[PDB]
Amino acid sequence: NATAFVPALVASGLPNEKFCFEGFLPQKKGRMTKLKSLVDEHRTMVFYESPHRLLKTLTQFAEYFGPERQVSVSREISKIHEETVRGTLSELIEHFTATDPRGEIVIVLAGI
Amino acid sequence: NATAFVPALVASGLPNEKFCFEGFLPQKKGRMTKLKSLVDEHRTMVFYESPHRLLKTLTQFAEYFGPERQVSVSREISKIHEETVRGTLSELIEHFTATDPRGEIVIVLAGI
The Cα–Cα gap between B9 and A77 comes to: 20
- Degrees to nearest 5, angle at CA A91 with B18 and A58: 110
Nearest residue, CB atoms, B83 vs list A83, A86, A92 = A83
Chains A–B, number of C-beta pairs less than 8 Å apart: 45
Total domains in chain A come to 1
The Cα–Cα gap between B96 and B39 comes to: 23
Cβ-Cβ contacts under 8 Å, B7 against chain A = 86
- CATH number reported for the structural domain that contains residue B37 in this entry: 3.30.950.10
Strand partners, B86: B72
Q: How was this structure determined?
A: X-ray
The Cα–Cα gap between B39 and B65 comes to: 6
Helices (H), B1-112: 5-11, 31-37, 54-65, 89-98
Coil, strand or helix at B21:
strand
Nearest residue, CB atoms, A80 vs list B81, B82, B95 = B95
Coil, strand or helix at A105:
strand
A112: exposed, middle or buried (Cβ count in 10 Å: 0-12, 13-18, 19+): exposed
Coil, strand or helix at B90:
helix
Distance from CA of B8 to the nearest CA of A (A): 9
Cβ-Cβ contacts under 8 Å, B86 against chain A = 7, 10, 80, 82
Q: What domain range is A36 assigned to?
A: 1-112
Contacts of A33 (CB under 8 A, 6+ apart): A26
Task: State the resolution, in angstroms.
Answer: 2.0
Distance from CA of B97 to the nearest CA of A (A): 14
HEC states along chain A? CCCCHHHHHHHCCCCCCCEEEEECCCCECEHHHHHHHCCCCCCEEEEEECCCCHHHHHHHHHHHHCCCCEEEEEEECCCCEEEEEEEEHHHHHHHHHHCCCCCCEEEEECCC
Q: Quick check: B47 and B104 in contact, CB under 8 A?
A: no
Identify the contact set of chain B against chain A, taking CB-CB distances under 8 A. 7, 10-11, 13, 77, 80-87, 91-92, 95
The Cα–Cα gap between B43 and A94 comes to: 36
- Degrees to nearest 5, angle at CA B83 with A72 and B53: 155
Chain B residue closest in CA terms to A16: B13
Nearest residue, CB atoms, B87 vs list A80, A86, A87 = A80
